[PDB]
Amino acid sequence: MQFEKVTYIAVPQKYGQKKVGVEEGPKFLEKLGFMNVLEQVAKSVNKKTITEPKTPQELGVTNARNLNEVESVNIELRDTIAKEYDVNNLLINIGGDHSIGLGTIAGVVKAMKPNARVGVVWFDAHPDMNTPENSPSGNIHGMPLACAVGLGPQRLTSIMPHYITPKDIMYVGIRSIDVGEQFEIQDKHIDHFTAEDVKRVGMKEVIEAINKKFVDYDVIHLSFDIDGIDPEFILGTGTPVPKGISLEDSLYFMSEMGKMKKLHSVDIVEYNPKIEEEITGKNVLKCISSLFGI
Amino acid sequence: QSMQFEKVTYIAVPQKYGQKKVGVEEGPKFLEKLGFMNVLEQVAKSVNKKTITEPKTPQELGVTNARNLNEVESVNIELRDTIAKEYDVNNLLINIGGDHSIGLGTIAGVVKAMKPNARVGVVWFDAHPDMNTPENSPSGNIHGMPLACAVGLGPQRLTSIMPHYITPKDIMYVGIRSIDVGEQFEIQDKHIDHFTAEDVKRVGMKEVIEAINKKFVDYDVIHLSFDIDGIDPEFILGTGTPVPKGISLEDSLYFMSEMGKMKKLHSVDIVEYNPKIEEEITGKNVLKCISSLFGIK
Ligand SMILES: CCC[C@H](N)C(=O)O
Ligand SMILES: CCC[C@H](N)C(=O)O
Ligand SMILES: [Mn+2]
Ligand SMILES: [Mn+2]
Ligand SMILES: [Mn+2]
Ligand SMILES: [Mn+2]
Numbered sequence: 001m002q003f004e005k006v007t008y009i010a011v012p013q014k015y016g017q018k019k020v021g022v023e024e025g026p027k028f029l030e031k032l033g034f035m036n037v038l039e040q041v042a043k044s045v046n047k048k049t050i051t052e053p054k055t056p057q058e059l060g061v062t063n064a065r066n067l068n069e070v071e072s073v074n075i076e077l078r079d080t081i082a083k084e085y086d087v088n089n090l091l092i093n094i095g096g097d098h099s100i101g102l103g104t105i106a107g108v109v110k111a112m113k114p115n116a117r118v119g120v121v122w123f124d125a126h127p128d129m130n131t132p133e134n135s136p137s138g139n140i141h142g143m144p145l146a147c148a149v150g151l152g153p154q155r156l157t158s159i160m161p162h163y164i165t166p167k168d169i170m171y172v173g174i175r176s177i178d179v180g181e182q183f184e185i186q187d188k189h190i191d192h193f194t195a196e197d198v199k200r201v202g203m204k205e206v207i208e209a210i211n212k213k214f215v216d217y218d219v220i221h222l223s224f225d226i227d228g229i230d231p232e233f234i235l236g237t238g239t240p241v242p243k244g245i246s247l248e249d250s251l252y253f254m255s256e257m258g259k260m261k262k263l264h265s266v267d268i269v270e271y272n273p274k275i276e277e278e279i280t281g282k283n284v285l286k287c288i289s290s291l292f293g294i
Numbered sequence: 295q296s297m298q299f300e301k302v303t304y305i306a307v308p309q310k311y312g313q314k315k316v317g318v319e320e321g322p323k324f325l326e327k328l329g330f331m332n333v334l335e336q337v338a339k340s341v342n343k344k345t346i347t348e349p350k351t352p353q354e355l356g357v358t359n360a361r362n363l364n365e366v367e368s369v370n371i372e373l374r375d376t377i378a379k380e381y382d383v384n385n386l387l388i389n390i391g392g393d394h395s396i397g398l399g400t401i402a403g404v405v406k407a408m409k410p411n412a413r414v415g416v417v418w419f420d421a422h423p424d425m426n427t428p429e430n431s432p433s434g435n436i437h438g439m440p441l442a443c444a445v446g447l448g449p450q451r452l453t454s455i456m457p458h459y460i461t462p463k464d465i466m467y468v469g470i471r472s473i474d475v476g477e478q479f480e481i482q483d484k485h486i487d488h489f490t491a492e493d494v495k496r497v498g499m500k501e502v503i504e505a506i507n508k509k510f511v512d513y514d515v516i517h518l519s520f521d522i523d524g525i526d527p528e529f530i531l532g533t534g535t536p537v538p539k540g541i542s543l544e545d546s547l548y549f550m551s552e553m554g555k556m557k558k559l560h561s562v563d564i565v566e567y568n569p570k571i572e573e574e575i576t577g578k579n580v581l582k583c584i585s586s587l588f589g590i591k
Contacts, residue, residue: 010335027332035326039306039345047331047341 001293005044007084007091011077012052015069016099016141018059019238021274023052026094028273032281034094040294046084050076063132064153070140074103074159081107087219087264092288095269097238098128101223102144102159104267108221110161118164119214120148121257123172124225125195125241127181134180141270145169146184166190168217170210172253173198173228176241195244203249207256214262222257223267226284236280237270247283254290266291296589297554301340303380303387307373308348311365312395312437314355315534317570319348322390324569328577330390330584337588342380346372359428360449366436370399370455377403383515383560388584391565393534394424397519398440398455400563404517406457414460415510416444417553419468420521421491421537423477430476437566441465442480462486464513466506468549469494469524472537491524491540499545503552510558518553519563522580532576533566543579550586562587 010026026034026049038045053069077093077100085091085108093104101122108118122128122145130142131152140156147156150163157163166188175195177185185192191213193206214220227237230244245253257263271284306322322330322345334341349365373389373396381387381404389400397418405414418424418441426438427447436452443452446459453459462484471491473481481488487509489502510516523533526540541549553559567580585591 027329030331031327031329033323033327035331035343036323043345043347045343047343049335049339051339 003042003089005046005089006038006042007046007048007086007089008038009048009050009077009080009091009093011050011073011093011096011100013050013073013096013100015053015057015066015073016097017139017238018057018065019272019275022095022097022238022270022272024273025096025271028277028281029094029271029284032285034285034288037285037289037292037294041090041292048080048084050080062138063135064140065138067140067153067155070099071155071159074100074106074156077103078106078110078159081265082110085111085265089264091265093265093267095267095271097141098124098225098269099141099144100269101128101267102147102156104223104265105148105164105221106159106161108219108265109164112218114162116219117217118168119170119217119220119262120164120168121170121172121210121220121222123222123228123253124174125176125227125244126225126239127171127174127177127185129181129184130178131180134178136178170213172206173245175243198245198249203252206253211260217262219264220260220262221265222263223269224287225270226268226280227270229283233283234280236272236276238272238275247286250287251290254287255293258291258293295336295585295591297337299338299385301342301385302334302338303382303385304334304341304343305373305376305387305389306343306345307369307389307392307396308346309369309392309396311349311353311362311369312393313435313534314353315568315571318391318393318534318566318568320569321392321567324573324577325390325567325580328581330581333581333585333588333590336590337386344376344380346376358434359431360436361434363436363449363451366395367451367455370396370402370452373399374402374406374455377561378406381407381561385560387561389561389563391563391567394420394437394521394565395440396565397424397563398443398452400519400561401444401460401517402455402457404515404561405460408514410458412515413513414464415513415516415558416460416465417468417506417516417518418465419518419524419549420470421472421523421540422521422535423467423470423473423481425477425480426474427476430474432474466509468502469541471539472535494541494545499548502549507556513558515560516556516558517561518559519565520583521566522564522576523566525579529579530576532568532572534568534571543582546583547586550583551589554587554589
């Protein structure tokens with residue numbers, strides 16, 4: 001609809017994974033008209049840029065690569081969100097890799113009182129619930145939700161003011177799951193719709209399950225990894241996985257999420273314009289537009 | 295670059311109603327597309343953007359002395375008031391137009407932000423003095439009138455936007471070369487300081503900067519209003535009233551670099567970019583001027 005303001009945080013983070021370019025996601029969305037999209041929603045946009053680390057990438061074998069750079073980015077991001085989050089306005093974080101989702105959830109939790117119930121909708125091909133001990137890659141972008149729930153190294157889990165719980169999460173579109181993540185999903189009974197589930201039951205049913213799930217929560221946070229979307233439409237991303245959510249279902253999903261009165265914050269992550277720029281960037285802008293009702 | 299601030303206030307002013315050609319209202323949108331936000335990112339981690347409301351009313355086509363006065367009034371009032379709230383002597387404010395009719399709102403805003411006794415200096419980089427009135431305008435296009443309105447010469451609905459008037463002695467013109475009879479009369483009769491484009495060639499831009507430093511030494515603040523058609527049309531094609539024999543790109547960049555170093559400068563207008571006339575060459579050259587201002591090179 002329209003807000004008095006939108007807080008827009010640009011998070012130029014690549015250190016959660018190995019491929020260069022995902023840090024330029026904000027820059028390229030701006031080039032494709034992101035500011036003009038925000039202009040339809042609010043006359044005031046407060047932009048914040050999180051500081052880009054400028055160190056060499058750790059390109060060798062490790063269980064948690066560039067932990068320093070992920071820590072420092074998520075700390076700054078948490079603290080910025082803690083100051084700018086507002087239940088009467090909207091906050092949009094543009095990444096950057098999905099390692100920023102730790103900072104992003106941490107920020108919403110820090111903004112709210114200690115007793116607040118915070119819901120998380122995680123639209124992604126991946127559950128992002130690995131740890132350094134079970135990660136096949138050592139790429140911290142596959143770990144943030146584990147860190148948010150208290151599973152991970154101390155320097156990352158401690159970014160949370162307190163942990164969220166597995167019950168607070170709704171997964172949407174997941175289809176690439178590692179053994180540790182499967183274990184968590186089944187052992188903690190984490191609510192989810194795989195990509196195939198979405199096909200079977202339809203996105204309307206997904207939205208209904210979200211409304212029922214978070215009915216007694218204070219706020220909902222959406223974390224939207226563009227690789228949730230089928231690679232036919234989203235090519236410019238580091239870990240594409242086939243048989244994803246259709247563009248059509250993604251736009252309906254975003255439209256319906258945008259209507260939820262408990263939603264005040266959104267992450268759009270994993271746009272790597274150096275992999276593919278235009279088709280992807282424009283499709284990402286359609287998702288963001290749908291969210292806003294444009 | 296070299297400049298770093300806690301914040302930059304960025305005001306987008308999608309105004310075409312000061313003249314007849316469509317597209318100048320999209321100047322902000324197209325500068326954003328060409329990387330304007332990423333240029334601001336070199337200067338400040340916080341950018342507070344404001345968009346002035348775009349009027350969506352019919353263009354007054356047909357002869358008149360002041361076309362679409364309503365739209366120019368309402369835009370300049372909103373712009374003045376926005377600037378009055380956001381102007382900050384420790385940070386930087388940048389208004390992106392839009393036609394030069396917004397320069398009335400923009401000066402009005404700086405004057406409203408300051409105490410009533412403040413001395414406000416205006417540096418006006420332009421091919422045109424923009425000092426016509428409705429009675430002597432050859433066009434009725436209000437973008438040729440704002441500085442006249444700022445000094446109290448114009449219709450009541452525009453001159454009254456000023457909290458109080460600035461005076462002719464507060465202005466320093468740079469690059470002027472396309473002057474109407476009424477504007478020449480004001481320049482000569484009020485002894486308004488100026489360097490024509492030819493003058494700049496003769497004496498050099500260094501001498502221009504020195505004259506500005508000496509002129510405004512006892513002022514409180516300086517406001518720069520930069521009409522891109524001040525620049526020679528070799529480099530700036532995407533604008534509605536191009537005039538040949540302008541300031542070179544090189545002299546424009548040096549000018550902007552030196553302006554950016556002035557401690558009294560806290561606000562800048564970049565106006566008359568029409569990307570529907572020409573987009574890329576112009577837009578990129580405009581971004582170089584803005585970069586120079588901030589010390590980025
Ligand atoms: C994007 C995450 C991919 C994989 N699960 C990993 O942990 O590398
Ligand atoms: C842009 C200025 C053009 C002319 N001096 C006029 O006053 O219409
Ligand atoms: Mn993810
Ligand atoms: Mn993913
Ligand atoms: Mn002008
Ligand atoms: Mn001009």
